[PDB]
Amino acid sequence: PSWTDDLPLCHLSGVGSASNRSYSADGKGTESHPPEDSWLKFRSENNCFLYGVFNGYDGNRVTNFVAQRLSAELLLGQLNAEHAEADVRRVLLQAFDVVERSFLESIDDALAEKASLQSQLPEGVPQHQLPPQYQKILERLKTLEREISGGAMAVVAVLLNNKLYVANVGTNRALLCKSTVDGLQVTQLNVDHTTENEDELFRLSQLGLDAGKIKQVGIICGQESTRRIGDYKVKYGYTDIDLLSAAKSKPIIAEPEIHGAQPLDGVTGFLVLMSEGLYKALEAAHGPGQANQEIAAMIDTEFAKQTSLDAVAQAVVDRVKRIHSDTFASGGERARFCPRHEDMTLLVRNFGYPLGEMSRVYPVSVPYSSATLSLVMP
Amino acid sequence: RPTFYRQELNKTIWEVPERYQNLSPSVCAAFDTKTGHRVAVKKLSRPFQSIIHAKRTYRELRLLKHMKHENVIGLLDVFTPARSLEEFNDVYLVTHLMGADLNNIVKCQKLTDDHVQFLIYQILRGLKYIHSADIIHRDLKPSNLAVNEDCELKILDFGLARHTDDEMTGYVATRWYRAPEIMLNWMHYNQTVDIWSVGCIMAELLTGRTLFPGTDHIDQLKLILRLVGTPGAELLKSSESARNYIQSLAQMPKMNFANVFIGANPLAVDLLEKMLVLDSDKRITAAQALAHAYFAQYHDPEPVADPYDQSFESRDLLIDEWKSLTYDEVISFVPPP
Ligand SMILES: Nc1ncnc2c1ncn2[C@@H]1O[C@H](COP(=O)(O)OP(=O)(O)OP(O)(O)=S)[C@@H](O)[C@H]1O
Ligand SMILES: [Mg+2]
Ligand SMILES: [Mg+2]
Ligand code: NI
């Protein structure tokens, strides 16, 4: 049942992806959980372009949910090519708030049934010592947990007549990559929402917490993102968790940060959208430092060798798995960092960069001369 | 148990006991030798491949056993080649033959209002009777409507029928005869769906062409709303993106079906209008429509039947359980004299 699925696909982009994997000890063999990543790449009539890459955790219900609903909130008339920049910022904020409100609304009934069941179990008694009378209630509690769980991070791009906009909630990334005669110039258009982000640190402080002990702990509840879509455990149960306990407002918000008006006239290159799992896995293999620069350059290479943008994106994802797999397998220094990697999604949007294969004498240092040697040490 | 025999048609084997012979086409004609007249045999396409197919199959048997109206088909014989609750994996339904379908008839024959005027009255007669048994049909198309040489008619195909409730299956009906309520408010419709298709069939059995041949479920809502107008927001507020989509489309004015279908029976206009609106509450029922101006030539008030039992078929059951309650229902049949 989907009101958005007739929408034409974008002809100037391609997507590569691979699921999570954990490496076996027995030798070869891997295991996986169901993939929690997603993407979209539509072009409305309007001539509006919308791209997204989505990183899910705790199951993939929320990731799918934000993928249908944000399309319906953006490509059904609410964007058009003559929209000023103020227009675009308003519409994106409206869209993201609708999705987060209706997801929370979608599970309030289930959350209320859960509490009524949980009160029907003997207080404190480990469920395993519980007799067969309760087995039906436990069954149901396992099923409700499955339909309310999940969260998602999102990075979204809007292109209207050469104006590029970016909307970000979380740790996925957006790289604009231009060609100069010097070479490829990479810049990250969005900022990572973690506890290392100085402005999130100020926002967390202004809700009454301790920027100091928040920076120190670094993670919250499994994830590093200080912004996520969905996840009832942090949007409702944050008052229980400590050193996050005495906050005046929701510490982890669903509001996008918008970065906007990139002129793209006379630009030659490509746009990258990638999920956290892609660049984390490369930083596990090579050390932290220059993953944006290194992934861009991988893409540069495949542009000259492959026949479509999808093959380009997918070849880079394939090279990063092998690098990670080899690293674990080689036993050395960094293998301890690669027992597993997460879902990988990579999306490439072309801005006039060329795709396809169809697209001396050396003088001596000091000259001779017909006519007690030493060298300087360093 | 009559000794069975096997014949291949359209690349499959049909194992049928004798009586019937000289097969010629999911359903074939035949001659039951115990009787002396031509009959139609229906082989169910896949009877228990999923849990929903077994519960679609179980219902099509249990409902046809229930209805007795000269306008709704009922079963003369039901059989299976299999022996016990093990070999079971096939059922056959066999009904007195008609020699024509409404779909083929309209694919090569202009047609008069007086033809129409009668066919629909017959339809609404069976419909009013089906609704007065607590059962919705859900699939009314020329393909599954049958007519005699005289032009007598009965309703076919209960593969898609169910005892009504507030909670129902969402993806339902053929596309062109799919009530807007089907898609604009998922799972929460009633039996007004059946009547919407009757209007759809009403003006097809006239003009000769499909009223709303939309390609996708989106193209379909666009076609329907460009003849009934857009929802003025009284009916609107549906759900979320459904709203959203409609707001994306321009204002279409409602039209009176007078300017619409030229040279009409203005008697029929008025019935077409009172049938194919959008507001489910404010629109005709088979009864209030039966007793209506258009059918004064034939109206003679058209009786109701008993209610359909549920008990079993409103619970969660396995692909086994659903097929056994089907077999326990094929084993217990009794023919009519
Ligand atoms: N009793 C009958 N008399 C004459 N023609 C019949 C009769 N029953 C079926 N037919 C013909 O068979 C066609 C399809 O019959 P249906 O009853 O719709 O079977 P079906 O649609 O294939 O089954 P499903 O799986 O429940 S949708 C009709 O269009 C008629 O041409
Ligand atoms: Mg009832
Ligand atoms: Mg049919
Ligand atoms: Ni993930």
Residue numbers in the entry:
A (entry chain A): 15 to 373, 384 to 395, 404 to 410
B (entry chain H): 5 to 29, 37 to 248, 251 to 314, 317 to 352
Passage from the reporting paper:
The MAPK p38α is a serine threonine protein kinase that is activated by stress. A number of groups have shown that, during myocardial ischemia, TAB1 binds to and induces autoactivation of p38α, which in turn phosphorylates TAB1. In other words, TAB1 is both an activator and a substrate of p38α.
Here, we investigated the role of p38α and TAB1 phosphorylation on the interaction by solving the X-ray structure of the complex between p38α and TAB1 (residues 1–438) in their phosphorylated forms. To this end, we produced phosphorylated p38α (pp38α) and phosphorylated TAB1 at Serine 423 (pS423TAB1), measured their binding affinity, solved the X-ray structure of the complexes, and compared these to our previously published data on nonphosphorylated p38α and a short TAB1 (residues 384–412) 29-mer peptide. Phosphorylation did not affect the binding interface between p38α and TAB1; it instead induced major conformational changes of the activation loop of p38α, which contains the phosphorylation sites Thr180 and Tyr182. In pp38α-TAB1 complex, upon phosphorylation, the now-activated loop of the kinase swung away from the ATP binding site, freeing access to the catalytic site for other substrates. In pp38α, residue pThr180 sat at the interface between the 2 domains of the kinase with the Thr180 phosphate group interacting with Arg67, Arg70, and Lys66 from the N-lobe and Arg149 and Arg173 from the C-lobe, whereas the phosphate from pTyr182 interacted with Arg186 and Arg189 on the C-lobe. The crystallographic and biophysical data both suggest that TAB1 remains bound to p38α after having induced the kinase autoactivation and having been phosphorylated by it; they also show that no other region, beyond residues 384–412 in TAB1, was involved in the interaction with p38α. The structural data suggest that TAB1 does not dissociate from p38α after inducing autoactivation and becoming phosphorylated. The main structural finding is that phosphorylation does not perturb the surface nor the strength of their interaction, suggesting that pTAB1 remains bound to active p38α.
